Amino acid sequence: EIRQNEKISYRIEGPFFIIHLINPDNLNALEGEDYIYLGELLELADRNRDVYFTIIQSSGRFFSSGADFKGIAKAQGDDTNKYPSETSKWVSNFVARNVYVTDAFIKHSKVLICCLNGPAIGLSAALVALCDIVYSINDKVYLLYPFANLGLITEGGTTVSLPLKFGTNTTYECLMFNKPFKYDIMCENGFISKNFNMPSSNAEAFNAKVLEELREKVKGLYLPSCLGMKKLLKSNHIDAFNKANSVEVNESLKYWVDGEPLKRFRQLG
Amino acid sequence: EIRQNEKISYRIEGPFFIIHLINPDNLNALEGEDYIYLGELLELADRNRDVYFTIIQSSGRFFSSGADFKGIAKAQGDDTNKYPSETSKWVSNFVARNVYVTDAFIKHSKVLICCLNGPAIGLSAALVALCDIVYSINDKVYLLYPFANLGLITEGGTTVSLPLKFGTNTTYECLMFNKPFKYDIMCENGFISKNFNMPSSNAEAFNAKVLEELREKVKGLYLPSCLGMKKLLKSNHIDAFNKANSVEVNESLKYWVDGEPLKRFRQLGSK
Amino acid sequence: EIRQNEKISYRIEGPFFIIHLINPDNLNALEGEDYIYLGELLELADRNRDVYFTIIQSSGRFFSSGADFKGIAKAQGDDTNKYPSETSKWVSNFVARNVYVTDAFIKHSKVLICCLNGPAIGLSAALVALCDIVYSINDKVYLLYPFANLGLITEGGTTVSLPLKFGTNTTYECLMFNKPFKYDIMCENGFISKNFNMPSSNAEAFNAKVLEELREKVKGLYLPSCLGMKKLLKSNHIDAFNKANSVEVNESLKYWVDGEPLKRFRQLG
Amino acid sequence: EIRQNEKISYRIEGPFFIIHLINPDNLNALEGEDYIYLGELLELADRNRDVYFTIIQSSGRFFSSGADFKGIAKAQGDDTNKYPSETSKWVSNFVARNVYVTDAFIKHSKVLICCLNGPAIGLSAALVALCDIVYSINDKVYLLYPFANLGLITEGGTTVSLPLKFGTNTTYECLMFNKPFKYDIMCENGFISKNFNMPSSNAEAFNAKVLEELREKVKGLYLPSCLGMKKLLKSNHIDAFNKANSVEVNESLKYWVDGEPLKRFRQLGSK
Amino acid sequence: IRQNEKISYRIEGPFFIIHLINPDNLNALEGEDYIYLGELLELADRNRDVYFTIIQSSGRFFSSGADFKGIAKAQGDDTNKYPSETSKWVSNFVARNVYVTDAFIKHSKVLICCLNGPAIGLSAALVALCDIVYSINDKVYLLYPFANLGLITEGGTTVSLPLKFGTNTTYECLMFNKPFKYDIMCENGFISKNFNMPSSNAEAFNAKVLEELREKVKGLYLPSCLGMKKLLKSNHIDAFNKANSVEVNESLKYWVDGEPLKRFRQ
Amino acid sequence: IRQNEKISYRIEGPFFIIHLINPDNLNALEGEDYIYLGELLELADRNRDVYFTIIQSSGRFFSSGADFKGIAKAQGDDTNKYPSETSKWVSNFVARNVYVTDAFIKHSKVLICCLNGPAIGLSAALVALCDIVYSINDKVYLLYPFANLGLITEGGTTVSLPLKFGTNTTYECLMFNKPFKYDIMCENGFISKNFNMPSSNAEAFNAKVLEELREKVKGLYLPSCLGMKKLLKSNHIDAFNKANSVEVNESLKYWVDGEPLKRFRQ
């Protein structure tokens, strides 16, 4: 039991907990609240003894264009009474949320599978990179981490995930110059376990096939084994991620207080 | 330049940045916004080229009784329209503050001296433990970490610092049973670098004396040398503190939602 | 539910799981089997949701004089048919047991409290050093790690526990020269949280007072808090201990295969 | 000098120590005592000053199908008087063996070359992954880690090695679903240093060819230089492997006691 | 700084450009030229206007590494001078190597190398410390001839090579004295772009990379590139340090033994 | 090895005894005498008969650290010689310090120091790397005057001091130029035994420790002491290495700046 999101659904089928991003027109962008909600859901999946896989699915042409800049802008010039300082303001509206959800993903005990139904940006793309298995709809997917372009730094433990998952060098050229991690770089780096090579439009049809396939993949297997394995699997980089989360979230704070991100976030589009 | 805090003051003499907790009439108990302010002050101290020493100082009979209960209570029950869920509330109200001020101390580049003028409790005790050097007023000081008794767990990187600075077994006998790190364990463990042996009422004179001495101690020294050594000293456990900070904050989050802390902060305090 | 030991009892009182070493005449020495049994018990305590503290208590003038050399000797010249090599023999009779029980203590999730009712030696003393809280009966207690004297090396993660709990330097002088960690060095290093200053004979009377005291110490406290704390507390040295366990247990193997320990273990007394 | 193994042979040519799995008529499946023996051989190879390269080689159509089921079954149900409890049994029967042979490989000082003449499964696949260099016979090789399907978890430090050597995501898609690391992922991930493109029947010629080449490759080289570099290369993840080894072994221990592995090793194998 | 006849530098905007400019000798560097690099990197780091440090070279090679004619000069010519062989190589090798190596490891600007040719030995070890590598053509390679030279890993290759090419592929190369060729470099993503430019003109390639970098950096909040690398550094800084220290010291036994010198003499 | 006029050594049974023997100069050591120590430790380590390496000294001091008359010699006397100030101190300071420091950090025998007097600076930093310290009398102390000298931590004090005296007590000392006195040394267990011997005769103290060590080691399986230290080393080896590397390099900015020299000149 948990409050409902107009923008995010969840259902449980068999061993599978399914988070479904359900806001295509708005491009599945996420307000900091929906990010907490995401964290809330993960915790729910994790506490459930029957759940073994947490599948993150989305809708439309994108997975999520990251943070909703409408939600960013309304947390500033609309009401400036509220926080004794910018530092306080951004510790509440940025720092808090970001540590929380990132942590939620890092510590999550069940197999995280992400269905990339389209591109993912910024924090969402950071979360994508935190799932243990990623399948893609077609070959037109990509992850873009626009930090240098927005006057921010790495978030969602990308500091760790990105070079760990794509290579140090590849990560640099990308992050420094605002270039995307294109599909070719994903397959090259075994990031995407399977491409379903399905029509860009049909995210829903794709979302079901992944599920259809999983039911059969798990047939036979001793489920607690997956979990038990993931447990030790986790311990290679748990610490780097926890070390990174804390640090990323606090060093970014400085950029907000300078004010650049806001200047940049205003455009956009 | 920064906002003014009715509860906390700062001033710079030469190379010393001085933070001063100035509300004894309520045990120098800090509210969420106050811990943030503290952090801000530290960032200010850090950014200022002239400063080599950030000295945290208090007032009255206590250093700090820790988080405002009371301010904690106002964050709950008064306005519950506010946050979409219990979790959203405590991320904004507890995680936010704790993770930030803790980091402020962890990363702070200057020699960090706490002046223990009385006992420290909770988050505040935690900040004390994060300082580089501690002098105390008399042998009646102590640090109490009431977590088990508050329905909470470690905060302020105590997960790292307590066992790093008092030994592990002592840490457990203390934390798990809500027994204070009294002065003798503190001196034994070389925690308090000097005890000034001064009467408890005159914390003003104590605060003066420590500054007095500091001006003499720093004489002749190459102050950038202090900073450089600190820089290398810091890496010894910089990563541990970092990892702990992020985890401590998020893990406590599950206690606040259960509600115990609030149920407990309620009682035990009045009458 | 679990097999019974003639040499080790357990009972559960309140939040407290109590392991009681009950073999004084033999000086509570422990055969490798009783070591596994110890591990078995710990796991039992850990799986129990109602248990919050695992208290290890003993009997007589000693806590335990470590490994039973009778049990060591009978695992060699009595029957030498059995193992295709010494290497195999000692991997079964030494390595296996030692990793297991050490691991059992390291990973144990509930507060380990040890009641030192007398001295402890070798592996037992290693286990003592692995508990989170130690109280002593009187001031005539000591831990001796006789490794240099027995032709072995550090076990039970002492490699880690000892210098972590007593100091690098202190540990060296001790371990290198077979000197004990005397009571004075324990209190000096805040190792013993409380001395009950009770008569050396009256271990049973002491064992009860610790319990008597704990009931009152926990009164009030939010128990899951202790646990939750211990959880993060654990993460400072979990890895060093796990790294050490594996290594200690395998590097000791070489000493058995040379055969010195056996030559030495023969005397003794 | 060491005991003779009907199933495993060793010989030294110059600087090469050669281990040879020589029982294809049962898929080079190793029993508990056999894994130990392997380790012994490694220690022998390590102690021998003249040796710079330990080359593990197999026979027939498979490298190794992994642990003897079958030998596993004999350790259960035949004699149950034997061990005081299920836990005592598996510590002696599984923990013992696994923790030892895994360590043998982890710590081994010489350049460790596996010659993949066919697929590797389980503990055996795990040992392959622990070697420094792997050449394969043809593109039909693969490594399968059937843990989820056996009611088990990672072993042989695969917790470290698989994601260290194939990437993490790939590791999960594989491990969690009991899908093999096929040849193309292996070449893609630079796992197999050279593929000899030789027919599957003639593993004898394959084994010869790799040795053939090695004698040429080592020509002119300062062999102690190889050892020294390995020495430094090793520390990159020496500690991770160590930590993993100890944990992997003890954590699996709880599965063997539950009994699933045995229930599963039973089926799926006959007919 | 002083003037080096073999290494020039210029600052164009936010780019601190280092150009190795002694191609006839294959940009081979003496121990002092290495120090000098680290001295330049110090300049680049302290310079609040510089966000990128671009190392560039000349002719048909990036650099064939340590000047072997200089290794000889520090031997056989003057042997008075050092009270022991150990003291000799702590000075001529240990010192230089730790310093230059640390200078790369710790440098806070985006380090971009322009591989205009092959890189060998210590020079190659530096290439593998740069944050981004663009190549001239598919004829480049990195070669770490340590096994052949009676030496061990250097310039943090211990960490950096397995990091960047993978553990197994590193062993095949390091133990057997095989190069990391173009193909393996692209495969492991080492090369971010290949400029398919004629090997003849390295200069033409060099100005083209800078053309593209100026275009790439347009509109970006540059302090972000900085901030990110700060965070990015921490994944491995600790490990590169522990590397650098031992790497330097463990080689000493080899230098002191004599093989590297006997081996260099051919 | 060669012969050093200031440092002798003898092997008595399993003990490799190093004796600093230039008391009139307070056993102050030049950079080369440091190298020499590391050279001796190499001998001790390679010597399969040696299980203990005992460092011993002379007169009223263990050693006042770096020879300040030599720091001057490597300056002002000959300034031709080094193409830059940076190159100068990489050679005269960086090299020497990394080498000697690593030599202690990695040494596989039981390292026992006989504090017959006070130890300062780098010499003190070595004392804190020894595995066991016996003291002559309660008048000894360790002093790390880095704050006073315009320098930073050395010889792994970064790791070793907080390790051995505790983080907080280390700061009071390091920042404010206060010594770790006798009392604090016993308190943190640094000193394993105090031989309450007259400061007059250090020699008498030295032979007494060896008397006691020979008695102590009786009947023990010595290879065990070795094996245990191997394991024991691993708790901190990695950290001491990362220390040593940066420690050496970060000091350079101080040497290159000029303070330490201006400060030494008084």
Ligand SMILES: CCCCCCCC(=O)SCCNC(=O)CCNC(=O)[C@H](O)C(C)(C)COP(=O)(O)OP(=O)(O)OC[C@H]1O[C@@H](n2cnc3c(N)ncnc32)[C@H](O)[C@@H]1OP(=O)(O)O
């Ligand atoms: C806790 C708070 C966390 C804060 C941390 C902040 C740091 C981050 O996480 S970075 C993430 C921020 N994301 C971005 O900057 C991406 C910005 N968006 C884009 O670069 C573009 O949407 C792009 C180019 C990728 C795709 O655009 P395009 O294919 O042309 O489709 P487009 O027409 O723009 O989108 C369709 C609709 O979705 C809306 N939309 C798309 N993304 C967003 C968004 N992120 N926020 C709000 N609305 C959005 C558009 O406004 C448009 O709506 P409408 O036309 O009705 O006004």
Ligand SMILES: CCCCCCCC(=O)SCCNC(=O)CCNC(=O)[C@H](O)C(C)(C)COP(=O)(O)OP(=O)(O)OC[C@H]1O[C@@H](n2cnc3c(N)ncnc32)[C@H](O)[C@@H]1OP(=O)(O)O
């Ligand atoms: C970002 C948000 C962080 C939230 C994290 C929460 C976890 C933590 O950090 S733990 C810190 C919480 N602190 C505590 O629980 C300590 C509680 N207080 C005490 O155990 C007692 O003040 C004690 C026994 C130490 C001292 O009391 P005592 O010596 O009898 O003096 P006392 O009469 O109680 O105090 C004097 C006045 O100060 C007030 N006061 C003292 N501490 C506080 C406090 N923490 N909050 C609010 N008021 C306080 C008292 O209410 C009293 O005011 P008044 O009489 O006018 O109503």
Ligand SMILES: CCCCCCCC(=O)SCCNC(=O)CCNC(=O)[C@H](O)C(C)(C)COP(=O)(O)OP(=O)(O)OC[C@H]1O[C@@H](n2cnc3c(N)ncnc32)[C@H](O)[C@@H]1OP(=O)(O)O
């Ligand atoms: C999984 C397998 C693990 C194997 C790892 C091996 C490495 C280790 O763990 S080291 C631990 C080994 N322990 C030792 O070496 C300690 C040996 N014992 C002693 O040094 C002495 O018992 C000592 C001096 C401490 C105390 O002796 P003391 O105060 O004189 O009492 P003492 O008369 O000897 O003991 C009384 C009785 O208990 C018996 N006893 C005491 N300890 C043991 C023991 N460890 N094993 C068997 N019997 C013992 C004695 O034999 C004696 O019995 P009895 O007189 O009827 O024959």
Ligand SMILES: CCCCCCCC(=O)SCCNC(=O)CCNC(=O)[C@H](O)C(C)(C)COP(=O)(O)OP(=O)(O)OC[C@H]1O[C@@H](n2cnc3c(N)ncnc32)[C@H](O)[C@@H]1OP(=O)(O)O
């Ligand atoms: C210290 C103890 C460690 C214990 C840790 C346990 C965890 C692990 O290490 S996992 C390793 C276990 N291995 C396995 O589960 C693999 C099981 N085997 C298989 O999935 C199949 O042999 C397979 C499909 C790969 C190949 O089979 P296939 O190509 O059809 O050839 P197949 O006819 O089955 O084999 C030929 C003969 O070899 C035998 N054989 C093959 N593998 C084994 C084996 N692992 N154990 C015993 N016999 C085997 C077969 O029984 C058969 O003998 P026969 O026909 O005379 O009865």
Ligand SMILES: CCCCCCCC(=O)SCCNC(=O)CCNC(=O)[C@H](O)C(C)(C)COP(=O)(O)OP(=O)(O)OC[C@H]1O[C@@H](n2cnc3c(N)ncnc32)[C@H](O)[C@@H]1OP(=O)(O)O
């Ligand atoms: C601080 C001190 C650090 C010391 C650490 C030492 C460990 C290391 O860093 S290893 C680096 C050492 N480098 C090497 O061993 C590479 C040796 N060189 C070679 O294998 C070859 O130059 C090779 C095959 C790559 C290319 O040769 P090739 O394509 O035939 O061109 P080549 O004719 O040899 O070179 C042209 C000219 O440059 C010179 N040259 C090339 N490299 C060097 C060099 N490294 N040192 C001195 N001169 C060189 C040649 O001598 C030749 O000069 P000339 O004909 O006038 O006498």
Ligand SMILES: CCCCCCCC(=O)SCCNC(=O)CCNC(=O)[C@H](O)C(C)(C)COP(=O)(O)OP(=O)(O)OC[C@H]1O[C@@H](n2cnc3c(N)ncnc32)[C@H](O)[C@@H]1OP(=O)(O)O
């Ligand atoms: C590889 C190179 C490493 C470089 C790294 C540099 C950083 C470091 O390691 S720090 C170590 C440097 N040491 C110091 O700064 C300590 C300086 N010395 C002192 O503070 C004092 O000797 C002190 C107060 C401790 C003791 O002095 P005191 O008890 O009065 O005896 P004192 O009369 O000074 O000494 C007797 C003689 O020994 C000489 N002496 C003592 N120490 C030194 C020294 N370090 N160097 C040269 N001569 C010395 C004195 O000059 C005097 O000689 P003389 O009277 O014939 O001219």
